C-alpha cells in the first residue's frame, strides 16, 4: 500500500506529503527529525494511552455486577472509594498558567465551535469577533415578524425601525448617558478627549466618560464611535450617507459589537473524519487559519482606531482561535504500525495539530497572526479523570520536544463531561496546573456517561426531563467551584454549554443569559450571529464580579453528584413512550444520514417538532444510549424500535440536494443500518461512545462508492 515508512510506522502518503511540503516549511523543524519524533513518541506513549482505556472499561464493568444485584447511596459511594473511580480531594491550591492572551485570562464574552472541516465556516468563525448588531436583530426572530415588521424580499422599513429602537436600549443598558437617551442623541463629537452627544435642547457627556474608548475620523465629527463596557467592545458607525442612517436621528448607520472573541476549530464531534485522506483536510484548513491565508473571501486585519488621548491603537480583528482535538479513544490508519495496527487519532493530533500550529505565532509564513503571547491551545474532550489528564500533559511535553517547543507552550482547555471527570475535577485541574487555560460543561456528553455509567441500575428518565435533574444541576454549580476555588479568576475560562436551536435566537437571548449568571466567562455558540446576540448578555451582566462573590462557597456535594436519574417505578403511559422512542429514532436518523452518507458532522436536523437542532455527534450519544437503556430494561422490545425507525425515517427523507433515501429499502441503505446499530449495540459501546459504530459505517461507503 502507499504507506511512506518511518521507523516502526507506515504513514499514508497525503499525510506524510502534506506534512512534509505545507507545514513543515517555516517550522525550522527538520522533517528526518520530526518524523523520528512521531515514530518515538507514538511508541513510547502508546502503551499508556492503551491502558486507560483498558481501565475505563475495568471500572464500567465492576460497575455493571453492583447493579445487577444492590436502594443506597452511602455503599454506592464507598464502592466507587474502592474501585478507585473516586479519588481524595488534593489540597486547595492556584494554577500557574502563564503566557495567556488577554481573551482568554479576563475578557469574557461568547466563544465560536466551528467544524474545521468546513473552510467556509471556519472563516467566518474567525471574522465573528466583529459583527452587526442591525443584521442579527433584522434576520432573527428577535425582533418579532408581528406588525408589519415581517421578513420581505425588500428591506422592512417598519422592522428597521425596530431594529434601531433595541440598538438604543442596549447602548443606554451599557454605556448611560448622564442625561438622557441614545434614542434622542442627534450628533456624537470628542471634544477635549470627552464623548459628548447632541440631544434636541442640551448636550450630556457620558455618565462613565471612562467606557469611552476611541473613534475613528474627524474628533468634532467622527465616522464611528468606540465604547467599551465589561471588557467587550461596541462600534457605532456613522454615515448619514447609507440608506440606514439618512432616515435615523444620529446619523446612525449601525452597531457593531465585539461578538466570538475566542473560536474553537474542531476536529472532533462536529465534524467527520474516518481516513487520511478527511484528516489533511482538516489540518490544511487548520494550516490556513494559522498562516492566516485562507480563503474562499479572506480573513480580516485589525481594526485601527484613534485615542481620547489623541494617539492611534490597533484592536485584533479576528478571533482568538482553539483547536479542539479528538479525545484518547479512537485510532485513526493515517499511520499504521508494521503489524497494521491503527496508530491513536489522539497523539496524531497532538503532534500535526500542534505543528501546523508553530505558524500562528508568527508573520511572513503567512501574513496574519493569531496568538500574541505565544500559546498554543488545544481543547481535549472525553477524558475521564485525573490520569487521563495527567497523561495529556505528558503527550503535550513530548510534542512539545519534537517540536523544539518551550514547555507549556501547548495550554490545554480541560473538558468536563465524563461523570469521572466530574467528581474527580479538583484532581484533574491539578494534573493540568501549569497548562490548563478552559474548564467547560458539555451537558450532551456528560448526559451520555451519565445514562451509560449506571444503566444497569434501572430505567432512566426522559431526554428531555435530563437537564433539570439534580445530578446536572449539580455538576453545572460544581463546574463553576473548581475553577474558582483554583484561581481561574484574571487567568483561565470558565465555560458552559451550547445552544443547539439555531432559529431560536429570540429565547436564547432570553434563556442564554443564565450561564454568565451562574458565574462563567464564556458559553458556546453555533453561528457568527447567535455569537452578536449572545455579547448583549456579558454587557448586562457583570461576570468578573459574579466571579468574585462566589468565591469560597461549595454549591454541590458528592452525594448530589452522584444522584443517579432514574425514573419512579413505572410512571409513564404507551403514548408518552413511543413519543420518545420515535423522537429518539428522529434525531438519530436525521443525523446519522448525513454523517454516513456525505461525511457531514454538524447540521440543522429538524427535530420530531420541526424545531432546527445543531446536532453534534454527542447528541447522537445521548439519544442511542437512552434507547439502549429502555430496551435493556423493558420499556420497549426491539420490534418497536424497528417499527419506530422504519416509521420516523421516510420522514427524515422529506426532511432533504443529491440525497440518498433511507426507504423504503431499510436494509440497503447504512446509514439505516449504522442507526440502529447504534441502538442495538449501543449498551455494548465502550463508555456509551459512539465513534467505533459511526466510523466503520463512513468507510463502509466511502467503499462502497468502486
Ligand atoms: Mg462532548
Same mark, same amino acid.
Given at each position: 500500500t502507499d504507506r511512506v515508512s518511518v521507523g516502526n510506522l507506515r504513514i499514508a502518503r497525503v499525510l506524510y506529503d502534506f506534512v512534509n511540503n505545507e507545514?513543515?516549511?517555516?517550522?525550522?523543524?527538520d522533517p528526518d527529525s520530526f518524523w523520528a519524533g512521531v515514530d518515538k513518541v507514538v511508541a513510547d506513549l502508546t502503551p499508556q494511552n492503551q491502558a486507560l482505556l483498558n481501565a475505563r472499561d475495568e471500572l464500567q464493568a465492576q460497575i455493571d455486577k453492583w447493579h445487577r444485584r444492590r436502594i443506597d447511596m452511602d455503599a454506592y459511594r464507598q464502592f466507587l472509594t474502592e474501585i478507585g473511580y473516586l479519588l481524595p480531594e488534593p489540597d486547595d491550591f492556584t494554577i500557574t498558567t502563564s503566557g495567556v492572551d488577554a481573551e482568554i485570562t479576563t475578557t469574557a464574552g461568547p466563544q465560536l465551535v466551528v467544524p474545521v472541516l468546513n473552510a467556509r465556516f471556519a472563516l467566518n468563525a474567525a471574522n465573528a469577533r466583529w459583527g452587526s448588531l442591525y443584521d442579527a436583530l433584522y434576520g432573527?426572530?428577535?425582533?418579532?415578524?408581528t406588525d408589519g415588521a415581517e421578513k420581505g424580499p425588500t428591506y422592512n422599513k417598519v422592522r428597521g425601525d425596530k431594529v434601531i429602537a433595541y440598538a438604543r436600549k442596549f447602548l443606554d443598558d451599557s454605556v448611560?448617558?448622564?442625561?438622557?437617551?441614545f434614542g434622542d442623541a442627534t450628533g456624537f463629537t470628542v471634544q477635549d478627549g470627552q464623548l459628548v452627544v447632541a440631544l434636541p435642547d442640551k448636550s450630556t457627556g457620558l455618565?462613565?466618560?471612562?467606557?469611552?474608548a476611541g473613534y475613528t475620523g474627524?474628533?468634532?465629527?467622527?465616522?464611528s464611535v468606540l465604547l467599551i463596557n465589561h471588557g467587550l467592545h461596541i462600534e457605532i458607525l456613522i454615515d448619514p450617507e447609507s440608506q440606514v442612517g439618512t432616515t435615523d436621528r444620529a446619523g446612525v448607520k449601525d452597531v457593531i459589537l465585539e461578538s466570538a472573541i475566542t473560536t474553537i476549530m474542531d476536529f472532533e464531534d462536529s465534524v467527520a473524519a474516518v481516513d487520511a485522506a478527511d484528516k489533511v483536510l482538516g489540518y490544511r484548513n487548520w494550516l490556513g487559519l494559522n498562516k492566516g491565508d485562507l480563503a474562499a473571501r479572506v480573513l480580516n486585519r485589525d481594526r485601527n482606531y484613534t485615542a481620547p488621548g489623541g494617539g492611534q491603537f490597533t484592536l485584533p480583528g479576528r478571533s482568538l482561535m482553539f483547536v479542539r482535538n479528538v479525545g484518547h479513544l479512537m485510532t485513526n490508519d493515517a499511520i499504521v504500525d508494521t503489524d497494521g495496527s491503527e496508530v491513536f487519532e489522539g497523539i496524531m493530533d497532538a503532534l500535526f495539530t500542534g505543528l501546523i #500550529?508553530?505558524? =500562528?505565532?508568527? #508573520?511572513?509564513? =503567512?501574513p496574519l497572526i493569531n496568538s500574541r503571547t505565544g500559546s498554543i491551545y488545544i481543547v481535549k474532550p472525553k477524558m475521564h479523570g485525573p490520569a487521563e489528564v495527567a497523561f495529556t500533559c505528558e503527550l503535550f511535553s513530548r510534542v512539545e520536544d519534537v517540536l523544539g517547543?518551550?514547555?507549556?507552550?501547548?495550554?490545554i482547555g480541560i473538558m468536563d463531561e465524563e461523570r469521572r471527570t466530574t467528581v474527580n475535577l479538583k484532581a484533574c485541574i491539578k494534573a493540568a496546573a501549569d497548562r490548563v487555560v478552559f474548564i467547560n460543561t458539555a451537558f450532551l456528553d456528560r448526559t451520555g456517561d451519565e445514562i451509560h455509567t449506571s444503566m444497569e441500575a434501572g430505567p432512566m428518565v426522559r431526554k428531555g426531563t435530563m437537564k433539570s435533574q439534580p445530578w446536572i444541576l449539580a455538576y453545572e454549580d460544581h463546574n463553576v467551584d473548581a475553577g474558582l476555588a483554583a484561581?481561574?479568576?484574571?487567568?483561565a475560562q470558565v465555560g458552559k454549554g451550547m445552544w443547539?436551536?439555531?432559529?431560536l435566537m429570540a429565547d436564547m437571548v432570553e434563556t442564554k443569559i443564565a450561564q454568565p449568571r451562574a458565574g462563567a466567562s464564556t458559553a458556546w455558540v453555533p453561528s457568527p450571529t447567535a455569537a452578536t446576540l449572545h455579547a448583549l448578555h456579558y454587557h448586562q451582566v457583570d461576570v468578573a464580579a459574579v466571579q468574585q462573590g462566589l468565591?469560597?462557597?461549595?454549591?454541590?456535594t458528592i452525594e448530589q453528584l452522584l444522584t443517579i436519574p432514574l425514573?419512579?417505578?413505572?410512571?409513564?403511559?404507551p403514548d408518552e413512550i413511543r413519543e420518545e422512542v420515535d423522537n429518539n429514532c428522529q434525531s438519530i436518523l436525521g443525523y446519522v444520514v448525513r454523517w454516513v452518507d456525505?461525511?457531514?458532522?454538524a447540521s440543522k436536523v429538524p427535530d420530531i417538532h420541526d424545531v432546527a437542532l445543531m446536532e453534534d455527534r454527542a447528541t447522537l450519544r445521548i439519544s442511542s444510549q437512552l434507547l439502549a437503556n429502555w430496551l435493556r430494561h423493558g420499556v420497549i422490545t426491539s420490534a418497536d424500535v424497528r417499527a419506530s425507525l422504519e416509521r420516523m425515517a421516510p420522514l427524515v427523507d422529506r426532511q432533504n440536494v443529491a440525497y440518498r433515501p433511507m426507504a423504503p429499502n431499510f436494509d440497503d441503505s447504512i446509514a439505516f443500518l449504522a442507526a440502529q446499530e447504534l441502538i442495538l449495540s449501543g449498551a455494548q459501546q465502550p463508555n456509551g461512545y459512539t465513534e467505533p459504530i459511526l466510523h466503520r459505517r463512513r468507510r463502509e461507503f466511502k467503499a462502497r462508492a468502486a
Open positions: 507545514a513543515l516549511p517555516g517550522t525550522d523543524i432573527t426572530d428577535v425582533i418579532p415578524e448611560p448617558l448622564s442625561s438622557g437617551s455618565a462613565n466618560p471612562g467606557q469611552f474627524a474628533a468634532e465629527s467622527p465616522t #500550529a508553530i505558524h =500562528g505565532l508568527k #508573520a511572513s509564513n =503567512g517547543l518551550p514547555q507549556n507552550t501547548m495550554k484561581g481561574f479568576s484574571g487567568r443547539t436551536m439555531t432559529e468565591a469560597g462557597k461549595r454549591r454541590a425514573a419512579k417505578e413505572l410512571a409513564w403511559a456525505q461525511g457531514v458532522g
